[PDB]
Amino acid sequence: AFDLIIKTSFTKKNDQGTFGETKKVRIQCYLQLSVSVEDIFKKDIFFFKFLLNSSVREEPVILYSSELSAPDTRNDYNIRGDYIATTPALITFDGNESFINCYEITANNNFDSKDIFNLKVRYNTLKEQLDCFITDAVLIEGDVEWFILFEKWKTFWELEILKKLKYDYDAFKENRIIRLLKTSIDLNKTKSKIRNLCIEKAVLDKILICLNKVSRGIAVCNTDMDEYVRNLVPKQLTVPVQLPGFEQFFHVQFEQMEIATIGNSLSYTVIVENLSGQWGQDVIDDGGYIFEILSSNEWLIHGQKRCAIKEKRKEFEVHLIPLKKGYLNFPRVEITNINGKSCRVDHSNAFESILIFAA
Amino acid sequence: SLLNMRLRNISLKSEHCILSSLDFQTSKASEQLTKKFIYPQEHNSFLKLNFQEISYKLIDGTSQIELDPICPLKVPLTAFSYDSISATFKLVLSTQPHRVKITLAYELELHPNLKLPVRTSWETEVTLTSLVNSKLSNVKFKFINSNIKVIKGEKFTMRLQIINSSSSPLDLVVYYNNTINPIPLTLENQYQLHNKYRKIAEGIILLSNDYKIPVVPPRETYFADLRFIGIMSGYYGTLSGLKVLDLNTNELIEVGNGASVLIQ
Amino acid sequence: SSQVENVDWIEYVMSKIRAESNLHSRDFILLLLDFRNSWIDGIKLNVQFEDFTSNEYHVEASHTSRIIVPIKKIDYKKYNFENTPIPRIYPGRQFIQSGLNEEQTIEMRQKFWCREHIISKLKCNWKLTTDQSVTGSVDFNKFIEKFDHKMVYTIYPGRLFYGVQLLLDEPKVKVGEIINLKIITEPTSTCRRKQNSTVNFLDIVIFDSKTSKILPRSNRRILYNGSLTKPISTTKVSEINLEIIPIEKGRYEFSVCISKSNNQDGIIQFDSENVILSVI
């Protein structure tokens, strides 16, 4: 946060005088919302997963829409999974409230790992929304003759008192009670400040009882405060994101041959093929791309545990032998390059289990 | 010696055997020697090992006998650089360690003219619950068919063997508890625990609840003919709830550990 | 399934749900009665309820037989046991308080009326095995003890706080397709007076069904928009919905867990209701 001085020297035509004020402001040059991408690859469909999160311990934010716009480079991928919030969704710095925004992308011809996608998430801080709530609900409830009187000091109200308030965000997160912290603002001097200003008596009175009431902790949670964000401008955080760079893409499929008692061979045949043509990059059927079935403590592999991929499509048999009692996952697999390169693996049935039923 | 190998045998008390699994792979020496003399001018060369015969032989003194593998192993197999082939052998198991020999006869096939033979070999030794007993007592329990699979909804029967040899007859009473065990952990693990306890509680019912097993005289046996019926599809491995109470010292031994009911 | 229709109770439940296909299988409970024969000879039992009759059970001497008799759950929407004082069968005596605050008396009232519901509805007959013409009957007022907390939770769902309800579009979908599920939630009479509040949170925790293992929170199998946790009002019926997207083949359970607040412990109820979807 930094300070800024603006100074104007504007002139009018009806009068001869040269007017112009000189204001000093404090600007918050910090990004409240934080985003972290996480992607999943599967055969011919691509998945994004953005874990949207706040970036400050005591400044939770609220979300409205997070539609991911496709790039304008061409009639490209058809995106599917845009999110429009019926009501604002609250997110805090960290906890068991992981906000996930997921997208499913299907290509028309092929993928290219040089395009740029734009997220375009719209949001607001909870402080701003609740400030609108207090200044529209607890103070000007269904009144016009009073609001026209109060309009004189609206800019003061929204700048010297409303901005200085501190809201019990923990209390709101727990019980949705709109209460201030103990060391939020000292009314004994705030009343003196307003008294020092030329102010109408009833306006002073209503501001005083408003501050006292909200210090007492009014706790309207969901019956209201969902029709007041209409007049609140949203912030927007269009952020770019790109697919990760990699050299080759493989997918491995275990096919059953011809439930399964312990200590008995299960005949499986693995099918490994370099499906890199789908993603633009041409196949490399001679690279040092050793493929190995990681032997765990619950699966004994019989056959070719490891072999070097030097063909577009490779297939070979393998017999699995379980060790533990029941409901075991398939053995993990990995394709790693020998020199320095990286590649992405699509285990077709990573999360699938066999029920071993002994004897 | 680009045939670095290992033997990582694992015991199996369920079927009463030990599974010895040799796994031989091309070592880093193959990588070092490939680009030195095998094909120096080429950029991506590979070895062409061919295995004439692999033997896993059980030996005791002067006698020896070959052991076949679990699944078939096609003997005249090829092998290239960066390979790992493993074979598994089953031999039945106290304090008498075994003695085994592994011999791999193979040959490199540099060009289809010459073949250098190798006969590397080495000897070594094969070195590294369902039955439930009663604490502070000698009575012992075992299910005749601890591994039962039946269609869900149908009532089934499970035959519980009691061994009594301690001093005197027992008045043990068996029951299944159909109440959710109170939980004691984060929300994730705590809800996992609650779901497990609920599934245990209202999954199976014993149609002879609170059966008074009449008498089990000393140095004799008895068959508690328990009768069940399931109502939730699932795999109830080592099912809890089926706990037998002894009305002599208030033993609450968990007799259900030797049960592996599966119902669709 | 339909293969095992031989025993009486399963067949009764099936005919009821099939002939009146709006009730789910959740709206049924067993009673698990156990008749102990203390007579020298055997007796044939025949237990009866609202509509169905159980087949004959031969109970020989000095041996207990566990009888299954299903019951339809009683709904608090049309019984109002909350405000219905226990009848006084010999009125005219002046009124002296036993001494019980609101919670104790409402608990006792619910237990008593819950017990009384299934006494004026359940009966059984006799046939002595030796002489077939010694028929009779047995009452249940002098055998059925007072209920406990679990017995009231299972039969009377008004004791619980929220009567949530789940449903899907269809329980069959291919890989990579939005399929929303909507969770209806009506508070019960217990919640409207037991605790003061305006918001309670619930979770949409997901299980593997087959392995019966809970999936992680930010998993790689089920992708959804928005947080699983979200508030619900404690006074009005609240409807929520999600944007489940399957990723891999399998089955999932989609249970629900209502909590008072997002501070570790302090969970109101773990509802047992769940709806399964199989993706393939």
Side-chain angles (χ1 to χ4, degrees):
Chain A
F2 75 110
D3 309 339
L4 193 71
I5 291 170
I6 62 171
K7 165 152 51 162
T8 304
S9 309
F10 66 108
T11 304
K12 292 181 181 179
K13 65 178 72 66
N14 285 311
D15 205 287
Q16 63 65 20
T18 54
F19 304 155
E21 87 301 345
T22 303
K23 184 173 320 312
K24 185 183 286 185
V25 296
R26 299 216 74 258
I27 282 164
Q28 308 277 50
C29 55
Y30 198 67
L31 198 79
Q32 299 101 8
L33 193 150
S34 171
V35 70
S36 66
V37 68
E38 207 276 329
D39 52 353
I40 305 100
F41 311 85
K42 188 172 283 297
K43 188 70 163 71
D44 58 355
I45 51 173
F46 183 53
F47 281 104
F48 268 114
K49 194 172 79 69
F50 307 101
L51 170 60
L52 321 174
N53 194 350
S54 162
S55 73
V56 175
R57 305 304 322 290
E58 66 282 46
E59 306 290 310
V61 298
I62 54 171
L63 266 58
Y64 301 158
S65 66
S66 179
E67 65 183 1
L68 186 149
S69 305
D72 199 358
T73 176
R74 41 183 160 90
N75 189 359
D76 214 326
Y77 316 94
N78 51 349
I79 301 299
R80 214 160 60 61
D82 298 0
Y83 173 76
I84 301 299
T86 60
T87 191
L90 181 152
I91 58 184
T92 187
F93 187 87
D94 186 74
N96 293 12
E97 61 291 337
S98 314
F99 197 100
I100 301 300
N101 188 0
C102 64
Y103 297 74
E104 190 276 331
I105 311 193
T106 300
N108 290 318
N109 51 9
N110 55 349
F111 289 73
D112 186 74
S113 180
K114 289 164 77 216
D115 298 11
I116 295 160
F117 293 84
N118 290 335
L119 192 64
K120 190 166 274 151
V121 66
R122 319 189 94 194
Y123 75 106
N124 265 320
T125 62
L126 182 142
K127 177 162 196 324
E128 211 172 31
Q129 188 274 331
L130 191 48
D131 277 337
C132 179
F133 170 76
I134 190 167
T135 199
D136 212 317
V138 188
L139 196 144
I140 62 170
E141 47 262 51
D143 202 319
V144 182
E145 59 85 32
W146 196 94
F147 174 50
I148 191 70
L149 166 68
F150 176 70
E151 165 164 300
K152 186 180 289 293
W153 293 97
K154 179 249 283 182
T155 187
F156 171 78
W157 167 241
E158 80 198 78
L159 188 153
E160 284 321 298
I161 295 169
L162 182 148
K163 187 93 68 192
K164 296 279 285 306
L165 285 159
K166 291 291 216 296
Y167 291 8
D168 196 350
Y169 301 111
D170 291 331
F172 199 75
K173 206 198 305 316
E174 287 186 359
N175 290 318
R176 297 286 168 89
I177 297 161
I178 297 157
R179 198 155 39 68
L180 290 63
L181 282 78
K182 277 73 69 177
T183 178
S184 281
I185 193 168
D186 186 74
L187 294 166
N188 199 354
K189 55 202 271 163
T190 300
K191 173 161 168 288
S192 85
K193 294 202 51 43
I194 298 169
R195 277 197 72 75
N196 204 237
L197 307 199
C198 182
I199 199 76
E200 200 275 317
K201 189 70 180 290
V203 171
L204 181 63
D205 202 17
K206 257 181 65 52
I207 297 169
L208 286 170
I209 296 89
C210 182
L211 297 204
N212 288 118
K213 176 150 58 171
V214 180
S215 84
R216 210 81 81 78
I218 193 66
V220 188
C221 318
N222 271 310
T223 59
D224 297 327
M225 65 179 288
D226 63 358
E227 58 276 62
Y228 294 149
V229 309
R230 58 178 69 268
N231 78 318
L232 182 83
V233 303
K235 311 185 170 160
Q236 161 162 327
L237 174 43
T238 300
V239 57
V241 71
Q242 294 200 284
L243 280 70
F246 64 91
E247 310 296 342
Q248 286 292 345
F249 173 83
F250 304 95
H251 63 87
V252 298
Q253 206 187 358
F254 281 52
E255 177 87 354
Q256 172 53 287
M257 292 216 87
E258 64 170 2
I259 312 98
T261 191
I262 191 163
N264 282 53
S265 82
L266 281 163
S267 296
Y268 273 109
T269 179
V270 308
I271 297 169
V272 183
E273 39 175 353
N274 174 0
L275 183 63
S276 292
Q278 273 189 355
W279 292 43
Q281 297 291 42
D282 62 358
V283 305
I284 295 283
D285 67 288
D286 289 323
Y289 266 119
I290 55 156
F291 157 75
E292 65 183 1
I293 291 154
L294 285 162
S295 179
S296 74
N297 62 352
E298 42 183 346
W299 278 116
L300 276 185
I301 301 299
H302 191 296
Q304 208 165 22
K305 290 204 297 192
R306 187 162 71 194
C307 71
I309 290 154
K310 49 161 62 77
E311 183 38 50
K312 194 182 89 75
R313 180 171 194 272
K314 168 156 270 280
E315 61 206 330
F316 51 92
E317 69 275 16
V318 71
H319 294 71
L320 275 71
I321 295 162
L323 296 163
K324 306 301 273 310
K325 182 54 61 60
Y327 274 136
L328 276 55
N329 302 115
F330 292 165
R332 294 311 201 61
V333 304
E334 65 183 1
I335 297 169
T336 183
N337 191 257
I338 62 171
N339 305 308
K341 269 76 80 172
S342 72
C343 73
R344 199 59 29 68
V345 298
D346 188 359
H347 199 168
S348 169
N349 49 14
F351 313 130
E352 183 177 1
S353 55
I354 301 299
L355 182 62
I356 296 90
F357 182 76
Chain B
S1 62
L2 58 91
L3 274 296
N4 69 327
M5 52 195 48
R6 174 171 51 280
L7 209 65
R8 62 162 305 269
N9 55 61
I10 192 66
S11 66
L12 211 70
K13 314 201 262 212
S14 182
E15 191 276 331
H16 281 308
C17 68
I18 191 170
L19 281 173
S20 66
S21 62
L22 61 83
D23 47 351
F24 56 92
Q25 43 168 339
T26 66
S27 187
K28 315 308 298 303
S30 179
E31 183 178 1
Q32 293 179 356
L33 187 142
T34 300
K35 73 201 285 175
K36 254 179 91 182
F37 293 100
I38 304 303
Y39 275 114
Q41 52 260 50
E42 281 82 7
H43 55 279
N44 279 118
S45 175
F46 51 82
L47 279 72
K48 196 163 268 284
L49 276 75
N50 315 77
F51 288 80
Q52 303 303 159
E53 190 277 331
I54 298 89
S55 71
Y56 195 92
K57 289 159 138 178
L58 191 43
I59 297 169
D60 187 10
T62 61
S63 58
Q64 69 276 17
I65 187 55
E66 187 177 2
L67 290 165
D68 291 331
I70 290 159
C71 84
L73 180 61
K74 185 60 42 202
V75 61
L77 61 83
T78 61
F80 309 95
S81 296
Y82 297 104
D83 291 331
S84 187
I85 291 154
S86 66
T88 64
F89 306 94
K90 182 175 73 175
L91 63 93
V92 298
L93 192 173
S94 48
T95 54
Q96 286 77 245
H98 273 295
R99 186 179 295 276
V100 298
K101 183 173 76 172
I102 297 89
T103 305
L104 283 72
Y106 58 94
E107 52 83 16
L108 283 77
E109 169 187 72
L110 279 68
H111 295 88
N113 282 114
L114 60 84
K115 299 180 192 300
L116 277 74
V118 187
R119 285 199 72 262
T120 189
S121 86
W122 59 287
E123 293 82 3
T124 187
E125 65 277 16
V126 176
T127 187
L128 273 71
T129 314
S130 80
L131 177 65
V132 55
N133 63 350
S134 66
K135 282 136 71 179
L136 72 164
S137 284
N138 296 115
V139 287
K140 194 190 298 188
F141 310 85
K142 180 66 187 202
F143 288 90
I144 301 299
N145 212 39
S146 66
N147 274 347
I148 189 165
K149 182 175 73 175
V150 298
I151 192 66
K152 182 211 79 189
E154 191 178 4
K155 60 180 76 172
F156 61 96
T157 295
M158 270 183 32
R159 202 164 283 183
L160 176 137
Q161 183 154 120
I162 287 157
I163 308 314
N164 205 359
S165 67
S166 85
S167 88
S168 49
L170 277 296
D171 53 358
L172 73 165
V173 58
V174 72
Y175 68 83
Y176 195 106
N177 197 1
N178 285 124
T179 194
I180 286 180
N181 200 5
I183 55 169
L185 273 73
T186 188
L187 163 59
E188 189 276 331
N189 196 357
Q190 173 183 70
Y191 200 83
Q192 173 84 290
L193 183 63
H194 166 270
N195 181 282
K196 173 167 208 76
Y197 278 136
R198 189 182 71 86
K199 172 157 274 287
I200 292 292
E202 65 183 1
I204 300 160
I205 62 171
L206 170 54
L207 297 176
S208 68
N209 176 259
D210 291 331
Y211 206 53
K212 307 288 282 296
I213 291 155
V215 175
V216 297
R219 301 150 161 66
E220 295 188 336
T221 62
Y222 182 81
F223 275 21
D225 189 358
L226 313 191
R227 194 171 41 280
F228 294 96
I229 197 184
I231 62 170
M232 291 216 278
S233 56
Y235 161 78
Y236 308 118
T238 182
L239 62 86
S240 308
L242 172 46
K243 44 178 77 64
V244 64
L245 187 87
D246 194 356
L247 297 165
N248 277 5
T249 46
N250 301 20
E251 281 202 33
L252 198 76
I253 59 169
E254 300 293 328
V255 65
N257 292 3
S260 296
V261 172
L262 164 58
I263 62 171
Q264 290 80 12
Chain C
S1 66
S2 168
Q3 188 274 331
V4 59
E5 301 266 11
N6 309 126
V7 298
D8 62 358
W9 62 273
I10 191 166
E11 190 276 331
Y12 163 70
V13 170
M14 295 296 171
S15 72
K16 279 286 279 288
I17 62 170
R18 224 182 301 100
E20 162 45 50
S21 302
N22 193 8
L23 312 158
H24 294 88
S25 66
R26 184 176 176 86
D27 291 331
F28 276 107
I29 67 191
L30 283 71
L31 193 65
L32 269 292
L33 295 165
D34 45 356
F35 298 85
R36 185 181 292 278
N37 188 357
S38 292
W39 184 234
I40 62 170
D41 291 331
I43 298 155
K44 300 294 187 291
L45 270 292
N46 188 294
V47 185
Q48 192 169 251
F49 208 62
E50 267 282 323
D51 45 31
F52 80 102
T53 61
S54 62
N55 44 307
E56 291 184 356
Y57 293 73
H58 176 94
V59 186
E60 69 275 20
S62 169
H63 282 166
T64 307
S65 190
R66 174 151 280 230
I67 301 299
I68 294 167
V69 64
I71 281 152
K72 203 181 288 194
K73 280 183 191 178
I74 58 175
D75 46 347
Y76 64 92
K77 304 297 296 307
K78 57 175 78 69
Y79 266 105
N80 195 5
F81 298 154
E82 273 57 29
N83 59 5
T84 300
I86 294 145
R88 313 272 289 295
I89 201 74
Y90 286 165
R93 294 217 282 265
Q94 56 163 6
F95 182 76
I96 298 91
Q97 294 82 17
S98 50
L100 291 175
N101 62 280
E102 211 66 1
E103 196 263 315
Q104 307 173 304
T105 187
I106 181 64
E107 164 207 341
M108 165 181 92
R109 204 178 299 213
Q110 284 190 336
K111 294 221 295 216
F112 165 76
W113 274 111
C114 182
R115 190 189 101 90
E116 266 289 311
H117 179 272
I118 70 189
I119 299 297
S120 72
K121 285 246 197 172
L122 172 141
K123 61 181 79 66
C124 84
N125 295 341
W126 282 17
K127 283 200 290 295
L128 271 180
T129 179
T130 56
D131 183 359
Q132 303 274 100
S133 300
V134 192
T135 187
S137 166
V138 70
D139 70 332
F140 290 85
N141 286 255
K142 67 182 186 182
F143 295 123
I144 305 290
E145 293 82 3
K146 293 187 286 185
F147 278 31
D148 69 82
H149 293 337
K150 193 199 85 75
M151 222 165 284
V152 175
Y153 299 153
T154 61
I155 190 166
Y156 186 57
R159 184 61 181 310
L160 296 160
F161 280 64
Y162 297 70
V164 298
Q165 158 162 30
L166 287 86
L167 62 92
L168 291 147
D169 305 351
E170 320 85 348
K172 284 291 281 310
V173 56
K174 304 272 281 303
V175 176
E177 161 163 20
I178 295 88
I179 181 164
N180 63 7
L181 63 91
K182 50 156 68 60
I183 311 173
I184 313 307
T185 300
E186 65 183 1
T188 62
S189 296
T190 286
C191 175
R192 304 171 161 298
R193 44 165 202 76
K194 177 55 165 41
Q195 176 58 260
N196 79 25
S197 284
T198 315
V199 297
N200 285 175
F201 310 112
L202 80 169
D203 310 334
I204 301 168
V205 304
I206 314 164
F207 289 96
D208 186 74
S209 189
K210 177 134 65 70
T211 65
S212 86
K213 290 190 50 46
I214 190 167
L215 283 71
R217 184 51 80 90
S218 159
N219 58 9
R220 299 169 80 74
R221 305 180 67 160
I222 301 299
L223 301 189
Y224 47 89
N225 298 318
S227 296
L228 297 193
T229 66
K230 60 182 76 173
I232 61 170
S233 72
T234 73
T235 79
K236 316 209 202 75
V237 302
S238 67
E239 173 152 32
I240 62 170
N241 61 6
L242 197 53
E243 290 215 332
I244 301 299
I245 297 169
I247 301 299
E248 295 183 356
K249 308 205 187 185
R251 294 216 306 287
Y252 311 92
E253 217 173 358
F254 280 107
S255 165
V256 164
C257 177
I258 297 90
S259 295
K260 184 152 61 43
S261 64
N262 293 125
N263 296 115
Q264 308 311 305
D265 63 341
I267 319 165
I268 295 296
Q269 65 177 356
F270 307 113
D271 187 11
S272 56
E273 183 178 1
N274 63 7
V275 66
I276 56 171
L277 62 83
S278 53
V279 292
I280 175 155

